[PDB]
Amino acid sequence: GKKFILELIETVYEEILDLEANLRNGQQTDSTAMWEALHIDDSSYDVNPFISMLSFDKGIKIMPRIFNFLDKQQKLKILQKIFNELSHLQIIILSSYKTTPKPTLTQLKKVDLFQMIILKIIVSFLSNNSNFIEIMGLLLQLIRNNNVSFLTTSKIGLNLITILISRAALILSSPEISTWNEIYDKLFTSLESKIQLIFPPREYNDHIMRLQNDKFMDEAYIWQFLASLALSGKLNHQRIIIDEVRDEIFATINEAETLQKKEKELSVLPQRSQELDTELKSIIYNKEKLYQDLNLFLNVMGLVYRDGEISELK
């Protein structure tokens, strides 16, 4: 229960602080006490205690400090534990536009903190003497133990996937290359015909917009995901991707062009007030942003939107 997990987190901070005082005072560090404090090898509960800790702000806040006193095998086991349970985590449930269609500002902040800390940790683990087979194993754990599609309805799940595949791509035996093909295929099959769902619905965007007093959204992470999915696949995969997100391409082009006209009508006004000036700068920034993020994906496909057309590259 909640009071139990809170007591657990308290104990963990005490272990970390003792550990951190030792390292400062030059002397011995032994992470054995802190590791046990995590209850990572504890099957005695409904939800694993360490996992439940991750849905408290104070629990997630101590994760980097925990990783400072861990070896790679301990690091891997933790990430394995997490990847296993991803789509069940309370914070992921908060993160998905499906399970949480009307988040509060506070819930958005909790979500942002989680993905900020967790992603950085996962990234640093992959950037630090990590091999292909490690990454593959993590992707495969992700795919086989989760509703992959449900994960793609969260910024966190989407970002996690594109980090994993982009780290895969950025990297080797022939069986390893083949392993990547099998895994990509598994990932791809899990998403086939559900790709457009990565785009939250209009009701959700309107809600977020009203919430944050902002006329615009930021979906760079969505197009980034598509670009990396497309770059990691073969020509038939790319074909299937561009087909599933067809209407999103058109809608994006449509919005950009609507911005282009509003820009043209404000641009020719002399001595713009502060309000009109901030508005024009906003229009321009957002127009260019839609072009840029859309072209990140199209360029991968050998395509470009420029002067009212999707033309071939060069």
Side-chain angles (χ1 to χ4, degrees):
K2 197 200 83 179
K3 192 150 140 184
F4 165 70
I5 307 296
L6 290 168
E7 290 168 341
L8 212 165
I9 291 162
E10 290 293 305
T11 309
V12 167
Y13 272 64
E14 292 190 82
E15 295 301 339
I16 299 289
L17 284 168
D18 150 270
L19 278 180
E20 280 171 340
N22 299 357
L23 181 70
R24 186 153 11 158
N25 305 357
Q27 289 170 10
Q28 249 286 102
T29 286
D30 191 24
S31 62
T32 329
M34 181 271 289
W35 182 264
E36 141 97 50
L38 303 176
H39 289 175
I40 241 311
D41 302 315
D42 179 37
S43 334
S44 137
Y45 285 96
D46 15 318
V47 180
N48 176 266
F50 173 75
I51 292 320
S52 292
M53 282 198 290
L54 295 189
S55 286
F56 290 78
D57 302 322
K58 191 169 178 177
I60 188 78
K61 276 177 169 165
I62 197 93
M63 284 313 310
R65 287 157 82 188
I66 287 176
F67 267 60
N68 286 334
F69 298 87
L70 256 38
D71 54 46
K72 67 148 307 128
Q73 343 179 36
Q74 281 173 326
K75 285 190 176 85
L76 219 188
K77 183 204 274 69
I78 290 277
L79 296 181
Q80 285 174 331
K81 182 87 200 73
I82 292 171
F83 279 17
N84 256 243
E85 299 283 349
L86 245 225
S87 53
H88 299 303
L89 270 39
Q90 287 281 312
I91 189 69
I92 300 300
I93 281 149
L94 280 199
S95 314
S96 163
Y97 70 77
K98 269 193 71 175
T99 49
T100 307
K102 298 305 189 65
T104 63
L105 226 191
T106 293
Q107 295 178 328
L108 291 176
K109 292 181 189 169
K110 289 155 166 328
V111 166
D112 179 45
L113 185 79
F114 181 84
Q115 78 138 36
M116 267 199 199
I117 283 177
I118 254 300
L119 265 39
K120 138 114 95 169
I121 283 179
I122 291 176
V123 165
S124 214
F125 172 81
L126 301 184
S127 158
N128 202 101
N129 192 4
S130 193
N131 68 313
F132 196 73
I133 301 299
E134 257 167 23
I135 294 153
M136 285 310 110
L138 282 184
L139 248 190
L140 197 43
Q141 257 178 352
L142 201 63
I143 298 164
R144 257 147 41 171
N145 302 288
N146 294 281
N147 187 334
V148 173
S149 190
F150 172 70
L151 284 184
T152 71
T153 73
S154 74
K155 176 161 167 57
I156 308 195
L158 227 31
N159 290 330
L160 167 60
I161 294 151
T162 119
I163 267 155
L164 286 177
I165 64 180
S166 90
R167 190 67 196 174
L170 181 56
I171 305 179
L172 251 249
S173 289
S174 355
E176 294 188 336
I177 304 170
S178 307
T179 298
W180 170 228
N181 263 295
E182 309 167 32
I183 289 162
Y184 182 92
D185 276 333
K186 289 192 187 185
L187 180 67
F188 194 90
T189 299
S190 79
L191 294 186
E192 204 185 342
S193 76
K194 304 150 238 194
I195 288 178
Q196 103 88 31
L197 297 180
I198 69 188
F199 290 86
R202 179 179 184 162
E203 288 62 31
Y204 188 79
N205 302 338
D206 287 347
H207 169 81
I208 296 307
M209 286 182 330
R210 277 189 299 271
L211 213 47
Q212 290 182 304
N213 224 97
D214 193 352
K215 287 196 184 77
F216 301 102
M217 295 282 289
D218 176 14
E219 296 189 323
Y221 73 108
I222 300 178
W223 293 105
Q224 176 55 77
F225 169 77
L226 285 167
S228 293
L229 188 65
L231 187 143
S232 243
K234 295 165 169 301
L235 177 66
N236 183 59
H237 294 129
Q238 300 189 346
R239 179 189 68 79
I240 288 164
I241 298 169
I242 202 157
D243 211 297
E244 300 207 27
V245 300
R246 189 201 69 184
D247 292 341
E248 261 85 29
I249 295 176
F250 295 160
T252 297
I253 290 167
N254 237 85
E255 197 203 327
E257 289 301 332
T258 291
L259 294 183
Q260 181 58 88
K261 290 177 173 47
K262 201 71 186 184
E263 166 183 1
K264 290 170 179 290
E265 79 152 87
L266 263 43
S267 274
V268 301
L269 299 180
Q271 298 180 42
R272 284 165 239 121
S273 58
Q274 179 182 310
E275 43 261 70
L276 281 176
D277 208 73
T278 53
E279 179 68 3
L280 178 56
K281 290 188 194 323
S282 185
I283 290 162
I284 289 167
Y285 166 77
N286 279 280
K287 188 195 64 185
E288 293 188 348
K289 178 174 174 34
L290 297 176
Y291 265 87
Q292 284 164 36
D293 302 336
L294 169 63
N295 278 324
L296 183 72
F297 167 70
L298 295 170
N299 286 353
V300 174
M301 315 271 313
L303 296 171
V304 65
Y305 185 72
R306 195 178 143 220
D307 303 320
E309 304 239 53
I310 290 176
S311 51
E312 308 182 296
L313 230 63
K314 93 210 50 161

PDB file of all heavy atoms in Angstrom, residues 10-22 34 38 62-63 65-69:
ATOM      1  N   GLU A  10      11.678   6.417   1.818  1.00  0.00           N
ATOM      2  CA  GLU A  10      12.421   7.059   2.902  1.00  0.00           C
ATOM      3  C   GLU A  10      13.694   6.280   3.223  1.00  0.00           C
ATOM      4  O   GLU A  10      14.784   6.855   3.343  1.00  0.00           O
ATOM      5  CB  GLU A  10      11.545   7.152   4.145  1.00  0.00           C
ATOM      6  CG  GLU A  10      10.404   8.137   4.017  1.00  0.00           C
ATOM      7  CD  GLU A  10      10.901   9.564   3.928  1.00  0.00           C
ATOM      8  OE1 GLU A  10      11.653   9.986   4.837  1.00  0.00           O
ATOM      9  OE2 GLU A  10      10.553  10.252   2.943  1.00  0.00           O
ATOM     10  N   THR A  11      13.547   4.962   3.318  1.00  0.00           N
ATOM     11  CA  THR A  11      14.660   4.071   3.623  1.00  0.00           C
ATOM     12  C   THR A  11      15.709   4.131   2.525  1.00  0.00           C
ATOM     13  O   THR A  11      16.904   4.058   2.789  1.00  0.00           O
ATOM     14  CB  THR A  11      14.176   2.609   3.792  1.00  0.00           C
ATOM     15  OG1 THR A  11      13.081   2.575   4.712  1.00  0.00           O
ATOM     16  CG2 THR A  11      15.298   1.705   4.306  1.00  0.00           C
ATOM     17  N   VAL A  12      15.257   4.279   1.287  1.00  0.00           N
ATOM     18  CA  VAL A  12      16.167   4.303   0.160  1.00  0.00           C
ATOM     19  C   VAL A  12      17.018   5.575   0.192  1.00  0.00           C
ATOM     20  O   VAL A  12      18.225   5.518  -0.022  1.00  0.00           O
ATOM     21  CB  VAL A  12      15.402   4.145  -1.186  1.00  0.00           C
ATOM     22  CG1 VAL A  12      16.291   4.476  -2.370  1.00  0.00           C
ATOM     23  CG2 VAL A  12      14.853   2.740  -1.311  1.00  0.00           C
ATOM     24  N   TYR A  13      16.392   6.713   0.481  1.00  0.00           N
ATOM     25  CA  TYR A  13      17.125   7.976   0.592  1.00  0.00           C
ATOM     26  C   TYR A  13      18.176   7.897   1.694  1.00  0.00           C
ATOM     27  O   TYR A  13      19.293   8.391   1.532  1.00  0.00           O
ATOM     28  CB  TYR A  13      16.174   9.139   0.865  1.00  0.00           C
ATOM     29  CG  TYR A  13      15.609   9.783  -0.373  1.00  0.00           C
ATOM     30  CD1 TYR A  13      14.786   9.068  -1.222  1.00  0.00           C
ATOM     31  CD2 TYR A  13      15.897  11.110  -0.693  1.00  0.00           C
ATOM     32  CE1 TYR A  13      14.252   9.640  -2.353  1.00  0.00           C
ATOM     33  CE2 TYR A  13      15.367  11.698  -1.837  1.00  0.00           C
ATOM     34  CZ  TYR A  13      14.544  10.945  -2.670  1.00  0.00           C
ATOM     35  OH  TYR A  13      13.993  11.486  -3.819  1.00  0.00           O
ATOM     36  N   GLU A  14      17.815   7.263   2.809  1.00  0.00           N
ATOM     37  CA  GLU A  14      18.759   7.083   3.910  1.00  0.00           C
ATOM     38  C   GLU A  14      19.962   6.259   3.468  1.00  0.00           C
ATOM     39  O   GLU A  14      21.109   6.598   3.787  1.00  0.00           O
ATOM     40  CB  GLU A  14      18.085   6.443   5.125  1.00  0.00           C
ATOM     41  CG  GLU A  14      17.060   7.339   5.811  1.00  0.00           C
ATOM     42  CD  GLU A  14      16.584   6.770   7.135  1.00  0.00           C
ATOM     43  OE1 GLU A  14      17.300   6.960   8.146  1.00  0.00           O
ATOM     44  OE2 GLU A  14      15.501   6.136   7.163  1.00  0.00           O
ATOM     45  N   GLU A  15      19.704   5.191   2.715  1.00  0.00           N
ATOM     46  CA  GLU A  15      20.791   4.380   2.183  1.00  0.00           C
ATOM     47  C   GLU A  15      21.666   5.179   1.220  1.00  0.00           C
ATOM     48  O   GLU A  15      22.890   5.094   1.268  1.00  0.00           O
ATOM     49  CB  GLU A  15      20.248   3.114   1.497  1.00  0.00           C
ATOM     50  CG  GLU A  15      19.552   2.130   2.440  1.00  0.00           C
ATOM     51  CD  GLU A  15      20.459   1.637   3.568  1.00  0.00           C
ATOM     52  OE1 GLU A  15      21.700   1.723   3.433  1.00  0.00           O
ATOM     53  OE2 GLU A  15      19.926   1.165   4.597  1.00  0.00           O
ATOM     54  N   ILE A  16      21.035   5.960   0.350  1.00  0.00           N
ATOM     55  CA  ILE A  16      21.776   6.756  -0.631  1.00  0.00           C
ATOM     56  C   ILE A  16      22.636   7.834   0.045  1.00  0.00           C
ATOM     57  O   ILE A  16      23.785   8.063  -0.336  1.00  0.00           O
ATOM     58  CB  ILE A  16      20.826   7.415  -1.662  1.00  0.00           C
ATOM     59  CG1 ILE A  16      20.062   6.345  -2.445  1.00  0.00           C
ATOM     60  CG2 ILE A  16      21.606   8.298  -2.627  1.00  0.00           C
ATOM     61  CD1 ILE A  16      20.930   5.575  -3.424  1.00  0.00           C
ATOM     62  N   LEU A  17      22.065   8.480   1.053  1.00  0.00           N
ATOM     63  CA  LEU A  17      22.762   9.528   1.795  1.00  0.00           C
ATOM     64  C   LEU A  17      23.943   8.972   2.586  1.00  0.00           C
ATOM     65  O   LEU A  17      25.000   9.592   2.643  1.00  0.00           O
ATOM     66  CB  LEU A  17      21.793  10.267   2.720  1.00  0.00           C
ATOM     67  CG  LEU A  17      20.874  11.254   1.997  1.00  0.00           C
ATOM     68  CD1 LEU A  17      19.768  11.734   2.905  1.00  0.00           C
ATOM     69  CD2 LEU A  17      21.673  12.445   1.444  1.00  0.00           C
ATOM     70  N   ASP A  18      23.763   7.804   3.195  1.00  0.00           N
ATOM     71  CA  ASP A  18      24.871   7.134   3.867  1.00  0.00           C
ATOM     72  C   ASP A  18      25.956   6.821   2.852  1.00  0.00           C
ATOM     73  O   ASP A  18      27.138   7.082   3.084  1.00  0.00           O
ATOM     74  CB  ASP A  18      24.403   5.844   4.543  1.00  0.00           C
ATOM     75  CG  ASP A  18      25.497   4.781   4.599  1.00  0.00           C
ATOM     76  OD1 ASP A  18      25.595   3.969   3.646  1.00  0.00           O
ATOM     77  OD2 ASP A  18      26.254   4.752   5.595  1.00  0.00           O
ATOM     78  N   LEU A  19      25.537   6.257   1.722  1.00  0.00           N
ATOM     79  CA  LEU A  19      26.446   5.950   0.623  1.00  0.00           C
ATOM     80  C   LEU A  19      27.172   7.192   0.113  1.00  0.00           C
ATOM     81  O   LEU A  19      28.363   7.143  -0.192  1.00  0.00           O
ATOM     82  CB  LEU A  19      25.675   5.314  -0.536  1.00  0.00           C
ATOM     83  CG  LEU A  19      25.376   3.822  -0.470  1.00  0.00           C
ATOM     84  CD1 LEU A  19      24.600   3.378  -1.712  1.00  0.00           C
ATOM     85  CD2 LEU A  19      26.674   3.054  -0.338  1.00  0.00           C
ATOM     86  N   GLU A  20      26.437   8.296   0.000  1.00  0.00           N
ATOM     87  CA  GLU A  20      26.978   9.534  -0.563  1.00  0.00           C
ATOM     88  C   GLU A  20      27.918  10.251   0.408  1.00  0.00           C
ATOM     89  O   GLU A  20      28.793  11.013  -0.010  1.00  0.00           O
ATOM     90  CB  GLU A  20      25.846  10.466  -1.029  1.00  0.00           C
ATOM     91  CG  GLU A  20      25.260  10.079  -2.396  1.00  0.00           C
ATOM     92  CD  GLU A  20      24.002  10.853  -2.765  1.00  0.00           C
ATOM     93  OE1 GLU A  20      23.349  11.410  -1.856  1.00  0.00           O
ATOM     94  OE2 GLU A  20      23.667  10.908  -3.975  1.00  0.00           O
ATOM     95  N   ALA A  21      27.737   9.995   1.701  1.00  0.00           N
ATOM     96  CA  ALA A  21      28.603  10.565   2.729  1.00  0.00           C
ATOM     97  C   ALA A  21      29.941   9.834   2.765  1.00  0.00           C
ATOM     98  O   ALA A  21      30.991  10.449   2.976  1.00  0.00           O
ATOM     99  CB  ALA A  21      27.932  10.501   4.083  1.00  0.00           C
ATOM    100  N   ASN A  22      29.893   8.521   2.550  1.00  0.00           N
ATOM    101  CA  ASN A  22      31.093   7.694   2.506  1.00  0.00           C
ATOM    102  C   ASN A  22      32.002   8.103   1.362  1.00  0.00           C
ATOM    103  O   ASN A  22      33.204   8.286   1.544  1.00  0.00           O
ATOM    104  CB  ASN A  22      30.717   6.217   2.354  1.00  0.00           C
ATOM    105  CG  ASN A  22      29.893   5.702   3.514  1.00  0.00           C
ATOM    106  OD1 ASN A  22      29.634   6.428   4.474  1.00  0.00           O
ATOM    107  ND2 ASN A  22      29.459   4.451   3.425  1.00  0.00           N
ATOM    108  N   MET A  34      21.718  -0.645   0.159  1.00  0.00           N
ATOM    109  CA  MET A  34      20.818   0.124  -0.692  1.00  0.00           C
ATOM    110  C   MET A  34      20.090  -0.765  -1.705  1.00  0.00           C
ATOM    111  O   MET A  34      18.896  -0.588  -1.942  1.00  0.00           O
ATOM    112  CB  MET A  34      21.578   1.244  -1.409  1.00  0.00           C
ATOM    113  CG  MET A  34      20.698   2.103  -2.302  1.00  0.00           C
ATOM    114  SD  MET A  34      20.542   1.472  -3.993  1.00  0.00           S
ATOM    115  CE  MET A  34      22.167   1.799  -4.640  1.00  0.00           C
ATOM    116  N   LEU A  38      15.794  -1.483  -2.200  1.00  0.00           N
ATOM    117  CA  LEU A  38      14.941  -1.326  -3.374  1.00  0.00           C
ATOM    118  C   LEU A  38      13.830  -2.373  -3.458  1.00  0.00           C
ATOM    119  O   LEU A  38      12.790  -2.122  -4.071  1.00  0.00           O
ATOM    120  CB  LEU A  38      15.788  -1.362  -4.653  1.00  0.00           C
ATOM    121  CG  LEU A  38      16.914  -0.327  -4.732  1.00  0.00           C
ATOM    122  CD1 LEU A  38      17.757  -0.510  -5.977  1.00  0.00           C
ATOM    123  CD2 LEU A  38      16.350   1.088  -4.669  1.00  0.00           C
ATOM    124  N   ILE A  62      15.152   9.968  -7.048  1.00  0.00           N
ATOM    125  CA  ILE A  62      16.380   9.394  -6.517  1.00  0.00           C
ATOM    126  C   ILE A  62      17.013   8.380  -7.479  1.00  0.00           C
ATOM    127  O   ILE A  62      18.093   7.857  -7.213  1.00  0.00           O
ATOM    128  CB  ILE A  62      16.155   8.754  -5.121  1.00  0.00           C
ATOM    129  CG1 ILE A  62      17.483   8.541  -4.384  1.00  0.00           C
ATOM    130  CG2 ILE A  62      15.389   7.451  -5.249  1.00  0.00           C
ATOM    131  CD1 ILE A  62      17.887   9.655  -3.495  1.00  0.00           C
ATOM    132  N   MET A  63      16.356   8.121  -8.606  1.00  0.00           N
ATOM    133  CA  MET A  63      16.859   7.120  -9.557  1.00  0.00           C
ATOM    134  C   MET A  63      18.263   7.388 -10.102  1.00  0.00           C
ATOM    135  O   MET A  63      19.082   6.471 -10.134  1.00  0.00           O
ATOM    136  CB  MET A  63      15.878   6.854 -10.711  1.00  0.00           C
ATOM    137  CG  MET A  63      14.656   5.987 -10.346  1.00  0.00           C
ATOM    138  SD  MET A  63      15.011   4.474  -9.398  1.00  0.00           S
ATOM    139  CE  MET A  63      16.315   3.743 -10.382  1.00  0.00           C
ATOM    140  N   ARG A  65      20.699   9.083  -8.720  1.00  0.00           N
ATOM    141  CA  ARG A  65      21.594   8.874  -7.585  1.00  0.00           C
ATOM    142  C   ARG A  65      21.788   7.391  -7.271  1.00  0.00           C
ATOM    143  O   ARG A  65      22.882   6.967  -6.892  1.00  0.00           O
ATOM    144  CB  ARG A  65      21.072   9.616  -6.358  1.00  0.00           C
ATOM    145  CG  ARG A  65      21.248  11.121  -6.463  1.00  0.00           C
ATOM    146  CD  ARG A  65      20.277  11.847  -5.572  1.00  0.00           C
ATOM    147  NE  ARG A  65      20.743  11.909  -4.189  1.00  0.00           N
ATOM    148  CZ  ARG A  65      20.004  12.359  -3.181  1.00  0.00           C
ATOM    149  NH1 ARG A  65      18.761  12.769  -3.406  1.00  0.00           N
ATOM    150  NH2 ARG A  65      20.503  12.393  -1.950  1.00  0.00           N
ATOM    151  N   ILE A  66      20.722   6.611  -7.429  1.00  0.00           N
ATOM    152  CA  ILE A  66      20.805   5.164  -7.272  1.00  0.00           C
ATOM    153  C   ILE A  66      21.771   4.576  -8.304  1.00  0.00           C
ATOM    154  O   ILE A  66      22.633   3.760  -7.975  1.00  0.00           O
ATOM    155  CB  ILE A  66      19.429   4.502  -7.438  1.00  0.00           C
ATOM    156  CG1 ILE A  66      18.546   4.773  -6.217  1.00  0.00           C
ATOM    157  CG2 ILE A  66      19.578   2.997  -7.668  1.00  0.00           C
ATOM    158  CD1 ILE A  66      17.124   4.220  -6.349  1.00  0.00           C
ATOM    159  N   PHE A  67      21.629   5.019  -9.550  1.00  0.00           N
ATOM    160  CA  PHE A  67      22.453   4.522 -10.651  1.00  0.00           C
ATOM    161  C   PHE A  67      23.930   4.901 -10.518  1.00  0.00           C
ATOM    162  O   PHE A  67      24.797   4.275 -11.123  1.00  0.00           O
ATOM    163  CB  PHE A  67      21.893   4.995 -11.996  1.00  0.00           C
ATOM    164  CG  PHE A  67      20.950   4.018 -12.629  1.00  0.00           C
ATOM    165  CD1 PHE A  67      19.784   3.641 -11.984  1.00  0.00           C
ATOM    166  CD2 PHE A  67      21.241   3.454 -13.864  1.00  0.00           C
ATOM    167  CE1 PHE A  67      18.923   2.728 -12.560  1.00  0.00           C
ATOM    168  CE2 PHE A  67      20.383   2.542 -14.444  1.00  0.00           C
ATOM    169  CZ  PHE A  67      19.223   2.179 -13.797  1.00  0.00           C
ATOM    170  N   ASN A  68      24.218   5.920  -9.721  1.00  0.00           N
ATOM    171  CA  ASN A  68      25.608   6.314  -9.484  1.00  0.00           C
ATOM    172  C   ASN A  68      26.365   5.262  -8.681  1.00  0.00           C
ATOM    173  O   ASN A  68      27.584   5.170  -8.761  1.00  0.00           O
ATOM    174  CB  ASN A  68      25.675   7.650  -8.754  1.00  0.00           C
ATOM    175  CG  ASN A  68      25.341   8.829  -9.651  1.00  0.00           C
ATOM    176  OD1 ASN A  68      25.517   8.766 -10.875  1.00  0.00           O
ATOM    177  ND2 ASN A  68      24.869   9.923  -9.041  1.00  0.00           N
ATOM    178  N   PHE A  69      25.637   4.476  -7.896  1.00  0.00           N
ATOM    179  CA  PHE A  69      26.259   3.436  -7.082  1.00  0.00           C
ATOM    180  C   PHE A  69      25.937   2.032  -7.595  1.00  0.00           C
ATOM    181  O   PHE A  69      25.880   1.078  -6.821  1.00  0.00           O
ATOM    182  CB  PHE A  69      25.821   3.563  -5.622  1.00  0.00           C
ATOM    183  CG  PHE A  69      26.218   4.855  -4.980  1.00  0.00           C
ATOM    184  CD1 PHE A  69      25.404   5.971  -5.074  1.00  0.00           C
ATOM    185  CD2 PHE A  69      27.402   4.952  -4.270  1.00  0.00           C
ATOM    186  CE1 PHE A  69      25.770   7.167  -4.473  1.00  0.00           C
ATOM    187  CE2 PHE A  69      27.773   6.143  -3.671  1.00  0.00           C
ATOM    188  CZ  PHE A  69      26.954   7.249  -3.773  1.00  0.00           C
TER     189      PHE A  69
END
